[PDB]
Structure formats: structure tokens, C-alpha cells
Amino acid sequence: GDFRAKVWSMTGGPNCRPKHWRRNTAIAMFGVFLVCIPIAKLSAKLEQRPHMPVRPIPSQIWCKNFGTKDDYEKEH
């Protein structure tokens, strides 16, 4: 309104129209992709697939934990 233009918030307050919002949006998208790379690596490392799939699947490209839990007697 009138006083809200003097109020700082993280989400930007009412009717937020930053002038450089396109470049900022692009920078945010690059940041989310960079953050997603290590998450994807950790997920691929951590995934456990006890059963071979019926047909080839995309996770077989990066995940090497297919058919490893067969000897569950030795689990600890």
C-alpha cells in the first residue's frame, strides 16, 4: 500500500516487480541445477535395486547396485 513500500521481506511483499527479474530468474535456475548435480550423484550412489528390471531402464546407466542384496544372510 503506502507503508508497505518501507517494509523489507524475503518474499518481496505485495505486488513485487523487480526490474531485473528475468536475469535473476535465470541465475536462480542455474543455481538450482548446480545444487541438483551433487544430489543426483549421491542418489545414484545410494540407490539399491535388489531386482533386475524386466527391460533395460535409465537407472542402469549410472547406478551399479543391481542384484547385490541376494545374500541377505550376510547383511549387517
Binding site: 500500500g1 503506502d2 507503508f3
Partner: protein, 109 residues
């Protein structure tokens, strides 16, 4: 005077009772063509007594009419969305005036 004011206050009660009864007739009818007849019939109730002159009897009729409204009132009346009680009421209100925001509060000096 006093008899004029006392009769005037009664008139206000009757005019407001009729307004509320008419608005509720629309809540129970929904379709326009049913409202026409229902409104005509309500107006005939008031018109039958329109010509009474005795003031105590007017008060008794007013009290009876209010009691009748309050019993046969529609449980879920229609409200314009931005009116009080409406679905849009107090959504995104304009900010109040007279609000000041202070800067540089609580400095060590």
C-alpha cells in the same frame, strides 16, 4: 412530539421487517418466477394489517412478525461476497492509514 416519534419508531420496525422478509423470500425461492409470487403473498400479509390505528396492537403485531422472521429464517442466507460475512470479505484489504515504519532502531549508541 411523542406520539409522532413513538409511531415513527414503529414504522421503522415494520419497514425493516418487510425488507428482511422480502430478502429471505428470495433465499427460499432461488428462481425469479417463484420469487414473484412469494413476494406478492408477503406483501399481502403486510397490506392486510396496513390500516390498523391502535398502537398497542401495532406493537404486538410487530413483535409477532419479528418472531416469525426469526423462526422461518433461511439457515444459509445469500450474502454479496464483499459484504460482511461474505466469501470475499476482508480479503486483500487496503492498508490502514497512519502507519509509520521506523529505521535504525535499537542502536548501541
Amino acid at each position: 412530539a411523542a406520539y409522532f416519534a413513538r409511531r415513527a419508531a414503529q414504522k421503522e420496525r415494520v419497514r425493516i421487517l418487510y425488507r428482511r422478509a422480502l430478502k429471505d423470500t428470495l433465499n427460499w425461492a432461488v428462481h425469479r418466477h417463484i420469487f414473484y409470487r412469494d413476494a406478492s403473498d408477503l406483501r399481502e400479509k403486510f397490506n392486510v394489517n396496513q390500516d390498523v390505528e391502535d398502537v398497542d396492537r401495532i406493537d404486538k403485531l410487530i413483535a409477532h412478525g419479528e418472531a416469525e422472521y426469526n423462526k422461518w429464517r433461511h439457515p444459509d442466507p445469500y450474502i454479496v461476497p464483499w459484504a460482511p460475512g461474505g466469501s470475499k470479505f476482508c480479503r486483500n484489504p487496503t492498508p490502514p492509514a497512519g502507519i509509520e515504519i521506523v529505521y535504525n532502531y535499537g542502536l548501541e549508541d
